[PDB]
Amino acid sequence: AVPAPNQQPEVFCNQIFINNEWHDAVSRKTFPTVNPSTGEVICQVAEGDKEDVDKAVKAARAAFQLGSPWRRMDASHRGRLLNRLADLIERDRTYLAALETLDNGKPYVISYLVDLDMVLKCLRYYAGWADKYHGKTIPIDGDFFSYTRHEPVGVCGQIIPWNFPLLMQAWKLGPALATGNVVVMKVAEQTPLTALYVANLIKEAGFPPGVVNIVPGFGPTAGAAIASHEDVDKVAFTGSTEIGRVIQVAAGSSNLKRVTLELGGKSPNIIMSDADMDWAVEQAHFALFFNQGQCCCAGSRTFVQEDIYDEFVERSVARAKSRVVGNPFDSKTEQGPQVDETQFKKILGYINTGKQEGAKLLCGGGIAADRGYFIQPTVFGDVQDGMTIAKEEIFGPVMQILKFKTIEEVVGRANNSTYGLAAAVFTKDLDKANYLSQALQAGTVWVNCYDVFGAQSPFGGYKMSGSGQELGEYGLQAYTEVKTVTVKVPQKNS
Amino acid sequence: AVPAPNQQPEVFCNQIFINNEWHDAVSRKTFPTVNPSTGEVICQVAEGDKEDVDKAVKAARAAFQLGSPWRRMDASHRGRLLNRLADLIERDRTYLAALETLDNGKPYVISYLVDLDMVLKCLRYYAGWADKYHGKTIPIDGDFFSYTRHEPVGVCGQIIPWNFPLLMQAWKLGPALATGNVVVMKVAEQTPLTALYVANLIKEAGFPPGVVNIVPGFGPTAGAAIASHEDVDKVAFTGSTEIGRVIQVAAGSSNLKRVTLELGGKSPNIIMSDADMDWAVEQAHFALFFNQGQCCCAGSRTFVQEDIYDEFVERSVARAKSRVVGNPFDSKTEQGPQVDETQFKKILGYINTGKQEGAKLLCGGGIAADRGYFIQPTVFGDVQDGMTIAKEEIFGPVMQILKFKTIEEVVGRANNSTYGLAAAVFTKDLDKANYLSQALQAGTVWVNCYDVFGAQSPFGGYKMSGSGQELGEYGLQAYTEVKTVTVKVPQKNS
Amino acid sequence: AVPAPNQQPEVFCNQIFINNEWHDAVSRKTFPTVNPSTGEVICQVAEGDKEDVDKAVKAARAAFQLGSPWRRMDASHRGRLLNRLADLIERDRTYLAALETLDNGKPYVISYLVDLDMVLKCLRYYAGWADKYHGKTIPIDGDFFSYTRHEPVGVCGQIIPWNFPLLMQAWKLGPALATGNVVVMKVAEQTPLTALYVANLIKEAGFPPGVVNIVPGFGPTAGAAIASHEDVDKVAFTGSTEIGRVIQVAAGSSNLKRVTLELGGKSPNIIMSDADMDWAVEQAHFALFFNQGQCCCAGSRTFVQEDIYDEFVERSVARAKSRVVGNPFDSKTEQGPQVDETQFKKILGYINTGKQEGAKLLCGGGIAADRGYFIQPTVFGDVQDGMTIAKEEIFGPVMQILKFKTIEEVVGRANNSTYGLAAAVFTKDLDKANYLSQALQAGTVWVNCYDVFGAQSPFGGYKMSGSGQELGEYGLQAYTEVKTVTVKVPQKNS
Amino acid sequence: AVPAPNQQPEVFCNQIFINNEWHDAVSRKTFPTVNPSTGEVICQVAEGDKEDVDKAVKAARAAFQLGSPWRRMDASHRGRLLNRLADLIERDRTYLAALETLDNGKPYVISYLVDLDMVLKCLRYYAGWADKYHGKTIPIDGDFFSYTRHEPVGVCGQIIPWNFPLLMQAWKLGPALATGNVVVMKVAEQTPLTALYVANLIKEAGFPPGVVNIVPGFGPTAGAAIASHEDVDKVAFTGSTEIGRVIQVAAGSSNLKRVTLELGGKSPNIIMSDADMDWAVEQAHFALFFNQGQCCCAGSRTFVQEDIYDEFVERSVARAKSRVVGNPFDSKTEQGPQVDETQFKKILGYINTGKQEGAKLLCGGGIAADRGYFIQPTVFGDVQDGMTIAKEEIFGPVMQILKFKTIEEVVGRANNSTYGLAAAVFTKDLDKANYLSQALQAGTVWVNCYDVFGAQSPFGGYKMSGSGQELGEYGLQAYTEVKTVTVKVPQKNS
Ligand SMILES: NC(=O)c1ccc[n+]([C@@H]2O[C@H](COP(=O)([O-])OP(=O)(O)OC[C@H]3O[C@@H](n4cnc5c(N)ncnc54)[C@H](O)[C@@H]3O)[C@@H](O)[C@H]2O)c1
Ligand SMILES: [Mg+2]
Ligand SMILES: [Mg+2]
Ligand SMILES: [Mg+2]
Ligand SMILES: [Mg+2]
Ligand code: NA
Ligand code: NA
Ligand code: NA
Ligand code: NA
């Protein structure tokens, strides 16, 4: 049961958030954010740059000073605040889901039942961790008492993408705040609105001024200002592999701040001959097409055993042809438009490359509408490992189906990639499942399912898909500093 | 590759071990220990009673005094001592394996390749834990610094059975010593020899006097004296459910000492129709017959799906008929004699009980030799849940095979038992394996295998099979006391 | 800011709670609960006995069946339910604090700002643990995949005392429900009201019928029925050392159910010569007199260094003389009446004993009013270790002041006790603090403070003060069963 | 008791170690390693460069292949191998200590009693961790079974400095090998010998070929090749802050390999007026002068409270003047030469800068011998924060003594640094110790002691002193990859 959406939600926040106050950019400049379903400008938003980042960093540093309200606050109380924030987001769920759809393009039904639900679950999960991430008392040699304190890392710069605006903001705020850090967040230029509204809720929840600061703006300006800042202790980045390299170099060239990266992928989804056919087809469809194909862990290489290849393909094509593309506010819409014009064109370019290289176009392949950035659900069959569409992240509704024969063969082909974010295996056999989950070089391996995320389970990639993890207890590590205190004692006893 | 055994190993230790020295019982009484393969007395052993236990507890208490060598010793050094003990045991491996077989009856090849290997692995595993079981620093509300110290419980009474003499001794000493406790061990009257020789190695390894004290003797005397002692802080017991009750009652009626119990079982081994037949038959045989059937976790209820029942039974009977029973020092021997006359008679009684209640005797069913306590591998078919042989622990070479139709049905039947030590499932299906491992109410569930123990994995029972665990990190909990220290500080900061 | 109390709160719940419904006792019998401030009957409460306990256990067992709503519920949702209960309790905070004061006797200001605050913080802390108590994946030897599942123990019997009705209920429900167990709680006959009202909130919060069942009644009847029940998996008991022994014996004599105990103490509060005089005096007063002296961890052995003894005593006597005893609903009242006539007489008897044995009566020593169970704040000086009042738990407003000379002396005297629940050290010296905190044999050692509890920090005693812990992560151990699942795999790799 | 050293130990290993074999550099080029006590060449060593690093990486990658002996080896066995390596190093303890002193310059007595002892303790500690670093089973929402596997990161490049040759190699190999990774180590050009001999012991211990590969050579050649290698998964660097930046940039510019840095510091050692004078003076001396002042965590900023400044300085000067500088093989020698000519000159330059900026030269200040690189123990008084010697790491026998008045003041001055490796506090006061340990921004804070390291306690820096940690359980995090496996199950239950 989904409440009727306001297809034209009002925008209340569109400025820079610092010290719980709204500010215009120092330059007074603004940039437009577009509704991808219509191609029309929603509103103007303050264009933050270096000077604005500097103001935000100083406010974060001030809020992080020893003896400040945020530093003195009981850990259990930080949890109370995260829970309060969640309650506020839930109060405004119908509104936020509509705003998310308007700015991003994803179906309102999904924004409401999925994105918003996950935001709530993630913040409430981390609220619980606030007073539970213990340090240790260590039995070192000699007459000493030794223990560790798990202290906050400090001023954390967080740069997020546009595919899951509210969820990415929650994935970053949750562990950072639970562990007592202060934040300077740079939201994506394509989707800054929902995050800004949440900042209003952060203030309402009672978080001390300076604890969370949000600077909307571009990458080479605001984003780079955060990465190269001399007083930013750590930077968490989620986005393209290309910018990930830029971020790591900026950190090494500035103050050696700590860096964590969540990059893209070209995740293999392996269908063994003994899989449940109906289930495997629907899951492989979901694996690739979810969120207009704009998922880092999208199952973009669908490997199907030869004995079931023909039937699997035939059913996959039928499902892709039946997928409803249209107005994201319409309850029947399964697929909305791509996020912007740049992405829209990039996808069309990859489709053209697929055709040129000899992949078999089975359905779709072009624009789905005259207005907005809509693309038809596209399926390529007989894809080979050396093809561009089999190697590069398309980030669109373009499915690649490859044929294989043996389990030893598919392991090697699946692993022959510079990416290692996720992978999946569909089979009824115990031994095959264990053999594959162990052998696949990926941060997450799903068995008989796909895109199953939980605030409790970590999500991080291997190889060039990034470093470190998000969600779960592991997510707390990157936001913690370890201090060992070793005290001389009169006579140590067990 | 097994070294030739000395079939008549000399006995060097047969007294009470206290403060690293050998003592006769205060009464000067001795008891004979019998070789179960011949029915002849090996030698006499000091018969410890209450007064001897009192001496041992006082020695253990003195060695646990604050400032003592054992209390001041670095945790890493306790690990060094455990590793040294393991090296000494390995040096005398061939001798210990033969002495184990002489007093217990198990095949020398098994004593050498299994028992001794597992003793070495247990001690070395625990040596590694000595300096890694950390306490915690806790983010409590207010201006305080709060942390916990993981201290030793103190004087630990350990009462062990006779089925795995050396191994049970190691399972008890490993975690207790790794955490800095002191021990008063009461070994089984049927198999005291190997543990007394290890005491000699404990002294040789460098353990301070009083850290380990061993008192051979009977149960209602020496064992009860430990359970009811006013200065024993904890008692660990492994044996019959019946004596487990007496122990817990003795603890409650004396000084409320902490108690952990490892009792018996009637473990269900479930063979689904899609299982690997050959593997399942051999493993089911091993699951029940291992160690002359004297295993707490013996797969004494073999449930077989109806479609493969006939074939499974036919193959199980052939395997049981081919099992070689004889002199345990002979390399061809698969099964030695039962531990003693009492058990021998108990098993014969159970065999007769099975015949009387209508179970189908398929093979064996009688005495296998003139001398010693040898029983023929026995298999009962068409066993029903309400039969006594399907409910009570026989602890002998007597197999029960039951027929079932569905997975839902077998779950209920397998769980309808007052015991819950272990269980197993043989199937090739992923979902059946996961459905069963979750649904089975047992401490350990094996999938496509049986009796697979690792020093790293915990082992404990559910229901009336006991409480607490042994092996792994979990085995350290019962040997640790948690002290919280909460300090007022000028101003608490994250 | 404390809201004006309803000095005569209406009673809405006074029956047996089973399956989210109210029931009279099978016998139809009821017992009166008295207001300790007036000595008058508040109302009648159903008198649960064995047959009632039998009904509650059956309800709990049914609610725990595999596939039930409580068993299938996501761990995170158990957390949501606990947070909801907390919210309901906060909504009815004013009412609950008043009802607590009416049935128990403690000052309403304290019930509201201390007890209710702690109930909320306990339930909210444990709600956060629901989905965070992980099992392990273990690198066992050989070609196997081994892991542990932390499952609920099952039907947990919880018998609680009268000193902190609401808090004791929270301390028990929090960890038990966070881990998915079902409960059959037997509240104290002296204070059954507030717990019964919370049962109504449990139902309102949405917990499935049978998850929490409450049986008001007497000890030897309802309490013993739970301890000896054949289908209760675990029993947690908080109360007298005497009954603790009965519980452990009942468990061993019945079904070997798991047992944890929290008994009394005779906690030493050590004031060194360099301590802050003013702080130490107020804290020692608090340590002993808090909650009408009805605390298990009361600092009932105040050790004071000779050089500051005279001054400390002088100041301690003045503070005791100024302590306001009267109507608990009056904002000026610091000390309410003792819980009942039995306790009232026991305390007066101890005071007589103190005078007979030569302790120096410095103030108080008699009845404080002709109505209710009020006792004057009493202080005994020059107390010696061998005195009855220095060894036995008085549980009243009777303070013992002892003189000592050296640090080695005080450590031994503090440790020369059958109890070991808590201890405290007041000093400005680093080394003295560390020397004492390590040497004192107590579950909790406070430094420059007393009675500092946090939901995050564990609380459990040493020696005869109990076994196991409550609060913190450690509290989850006793409510968890560990299952090892070991699966044969094709080829294990790191 | 230290065995008499061989003052001219023979060199057995001086080549590149790959696949358990010795190779000359592909270019055939060699470089001389100098004895810092005489200034003479000890021997030539193969000069590894990019091509050699390429061979090492291929060897490491081949040893890491799924199905390889190293990958299939039981975790417990990796522990056995580390323990065996430790035994071999202990067998050759006397020789190794001598060789260390010959190549490095530190006193032989220290090499034997400190360095070798810590190497043994480090390796044995990590051997224990091999089969104890568990993954987790997670209670995620929905009908799924989710767990994590802690897998090795893979090919780890390790670049180490010259101050503690053997210990640095151990600190690196211990955690890397315990977690199943493979190594390509680049030892310091100034001290390559001991590491190369240990490589021989690694082969003897039984480690599979290619698990550990050592490439002696220069930094911009061999070092940079590892940091920029496309097939190196992680790089761990210990050294100058300047090269740390180079490493991080090379990583971001190459394959986004994971990076951990262990840089220098300017650690504050704070002496409060209530400190034990004699203890504080000796410890402050040790803090700074240890290992020729060549310690990253050297107490190079000795803050002394004004009331005790004069006496402290006076006593410090006396101690520095009596410190014996000479032949490291002579038992009376407390300080040997500096590692090389470059360091020797840099230190002399800093002493010159100290005199020029107005620091009061109290003793020493020049060359201590005609031969080798010996420098007189130098002490500067009245040092100000803005001085060069007060800000830059000198890495020599040059002590800075600063005066302060208040605790609040020293906290600010101590923290006003770009570094944050360590700090110390000398005081008898409990509150002062807790106030400072919390307030100091450093990875390690010692209280009434200095340079207290334990294999159990983690060691890592804050700010520009590095990221990540070494030693303890924390040291395993950087060498582990986390894989999440999420499996669809029929019906999840608690
Ligand atoms: N859990 C097991 O691994 C295990 C082991 C051996 C036997 N059992 C079961 O026990 C049945 C009977 O064998 P048992 O008589 O040798 O077992 P048991 O319980 O009597 O003896 C085991 C240990 O406890 C000591 N003990 C005996 N009476 C005692 C007492 N009153 N107080 C304290 N300690 C006492 C024994 O001397 C021995 O050391 C077997 O047939 C089998 O079913 C179980
Ligand atoms: Mg870009
Ligand atoms: Mg018996
Ligand atoms: Mg009573
Ligand atoms: Mg350099
Ligand atoms: Na937009
Ligand atoms: Na025997
Ligand atoms: Na009452
Ligand atoms: Na050198």
mmCIF file of N, CA, C and O in Angstrom, chain D residues 256-289:
data_model
loop_
_atom_site.group_PDB
_atom_site.id
_atom_site.type_symbol
_atom_site.label_atom_id
_atom_site.label_comp_id
_atom_site.label_asym_id
_atom_site.label_seq_id
_atom_site.Cartn_x
_atom_site.Cartn_y
_atom_site.Cartn_z
ATOM 1 N N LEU D 256 45.126 1.282 -7.876
ATOM 2 C CA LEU D 256 44.309 1.548 -6.696
ATOM 3 C C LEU D 256 44.519 0.510 -5.586
ATOM 4 O O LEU D 256 43.598 0.209 -4.825
ATOM 5 N N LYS D 257 45.738 -0.019 -5.491
ATOM 6 C CA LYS D 257 46.073 -0.997 -4.459
ATOM 7 C C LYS D 257 45.835 -0.383 -3.076
ATOM 8 O O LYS D 257 45.833 0.837 -2.919
ATOM 9 N N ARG D 258 45.601 -1.230 -2.078
ATOM 10 C CA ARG D 258 45.371 -0.728 -0.730
ATOM 11 C C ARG D 258 46.726 -0.249 -0.197
ATOM 12 O O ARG D 258 47.778 -0.744 -0.618
ATOM 13 N N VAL D 259 46.688 0.743 0.688
ATOM 14 C CA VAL D 259 47.893 1.333 1.254
ATOM 15 C C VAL D 259 47.787 1.606 2.750
ATOM 16 O O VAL D 259 46.777 2.126 3.243
ATOM 17 N N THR D 260 48.860 1.271 3.456
ATOM 18 C CA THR D 260 49.003 1.527 4.883
ATOM 19 C C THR D 260 50.362 2.198 5.066
ATOM 20 O O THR D 260 51.360 1.822 4.425
ATOM 21 N N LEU D 261 50.375 3.250 5.878
ATOM 22 C CA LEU D 261 51.596 4.012 6.090
ATOM 23 C C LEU D 261 51.978 4.155 7.563
ATOM 24 O O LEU D 261 51.130 4.344 8.429
ATOM 25 N N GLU D 262 53.271 4.033 7.828
ATOM 26 C CA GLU D 262 53.812 4.126 9.159
ATOM 27 C C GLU D 262 54.939 5.134 9.036
ATOM 28 O O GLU D 262 56.049 4.805 8.574
ATOM 29 N N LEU D 263 54.609 6.394 9.340
ATOM 30 C CA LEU D 263 55.597 7.470 9.206
ATOM 31 C C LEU D 263 56.321 7.937 10.495
ATOM 32 O O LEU D 263 56.329 7.241 11.527
ATOM 33 N N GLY D 264 56.998 9.076 10.415
ATOM 34 C CA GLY D 264 57.710 9.564 11.577
ATOM 35 C C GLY D 264 56.845 10.281 12.617
ATOM 36 O O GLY D 264 55.601 10.194 12.608
ATOM 37 N N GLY D 265 57.507 10.987 13.530
ATOM 38 C CA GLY D 265 56.796 11.715 14.563
ATOM 39 C C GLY D 265 57.693 12.708 15.268
ATOM 40 O O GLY D 265 58.876 12.868 14.918
ATOM 41 N N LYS D 266 57.084 13.435 16.202
ATOM 42 C CA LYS D 266 57.764 14.417 17.048
ATOM 43 C C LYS D 266 57.004 14.306 18.368
ATOM 44 O O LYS D 266 56.408 15.283 18.853
ATOM 45 N N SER D 267 57.022 13.092 18.915
ATOM 46 C CA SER D 267 56.301 12.736 20.123
ATOM 47 C C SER D 267 56.648 13.487 21.410
ATOM 48 O O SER D 267 57.813 13.580 21.802
ATOM 49 N N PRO D 268 55.624 14.066 22.062
ATOM 50 C CA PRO D 268 55.780 14.814 23.320
ATOM 51 C C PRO D 268 55.787 13.893 24.546
ATOM 52 O O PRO D 268 54.947 12.985 24.664
ATOM 53 N N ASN D 269 56.772 14.095 25.419
ATOM 54 C CA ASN D 269 56.901 13.330 26.643
ATOM 55 C C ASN D 269 56.682 14.384 27.721
ATOM 56 O O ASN D 269 57.530 15.247 27.929
ATOM 57 N N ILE D 270 55.537 14.309 28.394
ATOM 58 C CA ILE D 270 55.153 15.290 29.408
ATOM 59 C C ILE D 270 55.409 14.888 30.866
ATOM 60 O O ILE D 270 54.832 13.917 31.373
ATOM 61 N N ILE D 271 56.218 15.695 31.551
ATOM 62 C CA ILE D 271 56.559 15.446 32.935
ATOM 63 C C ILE D 271 55.850 16.438 33.858
ATOM 64 O O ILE D 271 56.200 17.627 33.890
ATOM 65 N N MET D 272 54.860 15.959 34.613
ATOM 66 C CA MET D 272 54.138 16.836 35.543
ATOM 67 C C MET D 272 54.975 17.027 36.815
ATOM 68 O O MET D 272 55.850 16.199 37.139
ATOM 69 N N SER D 273 54.683 18.090 37.555
ATOM 70 C CA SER D 273 55.438 18.393 38.774
ATOM 71 C C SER D 273 55.372 17.340 39.864
ATOM 72 O O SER D 273 56.252 17.281 40.717
ATOM 73 N N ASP D 274 54.343 16.495 39.823
ATOM 74 C CA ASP D 274 54.184 15.444 40.822
ATOM 75 C C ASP D 274 54.783 14.088 40.409
ATOM 76 O O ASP D 274 54.616 13.096 41.111
ATOM 77 N N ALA D 275 55.506 14.057 39.291
ATOM 78 C CA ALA D 275 56.121 12.820 38.811
ATOM 79 C C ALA D 275 57.265 12.340 39.690
ATOM 80 O O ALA D 275 57.826 13.117 40.460
ATOM 81 N N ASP D 276 57.586 11.049 39.599
ATOM 82 C CA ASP D 276 58.702 10.477 40.349
ATOM 83 C C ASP D 276 59.926 10.966 39.564
ATOM 84 O O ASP D 276 60.175 10.511 38.444
ATOM 85 N N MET D 277 60.667 11.903 40.155
ATOM 86 C CA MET D 277 61.846 12.505 39.513
ATOM 87 C C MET D 277 62.876 11.542 38.920
ATOM 88 O O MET D 277 63.187 11.624 37.734
ATOM 89 N N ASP D 278 63.412 10.650 39.749
ATOM 90 C CA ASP D 278 64.423 9.690 39.298
ATOM 91 C C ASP D 278 63.919 8.829 38.142
ATOM 92 O O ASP D 278 64.640 8.621 37.148
ATOM 93 N N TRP D 279 62.679 8.360 38.266
ATOM 94 C CA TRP D 279 62.082 7.536 37.228
ATOM 95 C C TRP D 279 61.897 8.328 35.942
ATOM 96 O O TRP D 279 62.357 7.908 34.873
ATOM 97 N N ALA D 280 61.270 9.491 36.061
ATOM 98 C CA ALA D 280 61.004 10.351 34.919
ATOM 99 C C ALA D 280 62.270 10.765 34.136
ATOM 100 O O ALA D 280 62.261 10.797 32.898
ATOM 101 N N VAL D 281 63.361 11.040 34.851
ATOM 102 C CA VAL D 281 64.619 11.430 34.210
ATOM 103 C C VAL D 281 65.184 10.262 33.393
ATOM 104 O O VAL D 281 65.534 10.424 32.229
ATOM 105 N N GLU D 282 65.255 9.088 34.010
ATOM 106 C CA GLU D 282 65.790 7.914 33.327
ATOM 107 C C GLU D 282 64.939 7.527 32.120
ATOM 108 O O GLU D 282 65.474 7.262 31.041
ATOM 109 N N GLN D 283 63.620 7.553 32.296
ATOM 110 C CA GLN D 283 62.688 7.217 31.228
ATOM 111 C C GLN D 283 62.712 8.231 30.083
ATOM 112 O O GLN D 283 62.585 7.851 28.915
ATOM 113 N N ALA D 284 62.878 9.511 30.418
ATOM 114 C CA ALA D 284 62.945 10.563 29.401
ATOM 115 C C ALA D 284 64.222 10.388 28.583
ATOM 116 O O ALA D 284 64.242 10.652 27.384
ATOM 117 N N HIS D 285 65.273 9.929 29.249
ATOM 118 C CA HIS D 285 66.563 9.684 28.603
ATOM 119 C C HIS D 285 66.386 8.532 27.610
ATOM 120 O O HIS D 285 66.740 8.647 26.432
ATOM 121 N N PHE D 286 65.778 7.446 28.088
ATOM 122 C CA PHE D 286 65.528 6.270 27.265
ATOM 123 C C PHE D 286 64.635 6.635 26.077
ATOM 124 O O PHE D 286 64.948 6.320 24.920
ATOM 125 N N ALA D 287 63.564 7.367 26.374
ATOM 126 C CA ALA D 287 62.588 7.814 25.382
ATOM 127 C C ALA D 287 63.210 8.479 24.158
ATOM 128 O O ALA D 287 62.779 8.270 23.022
ATOM 129 N N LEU D 288 64.205 9.313 24.407
ATOM 130 C CA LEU D 288 64.875 10.036 23.346
ATOM 131 C C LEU D 288 66.104 9.320 22.753
ATOM 132 O O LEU D 288 66.190 9.123 21.546
ATOM 133 N N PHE D 289 67.023 8.904 23.608
ATOM 134 C CA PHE D 289 68.273 8.288 23.153
ATOM 135 C C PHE D 289 68.245 6.848 22.664
ATOM 136 O O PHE D 289 69.184 6.408 21.995
#
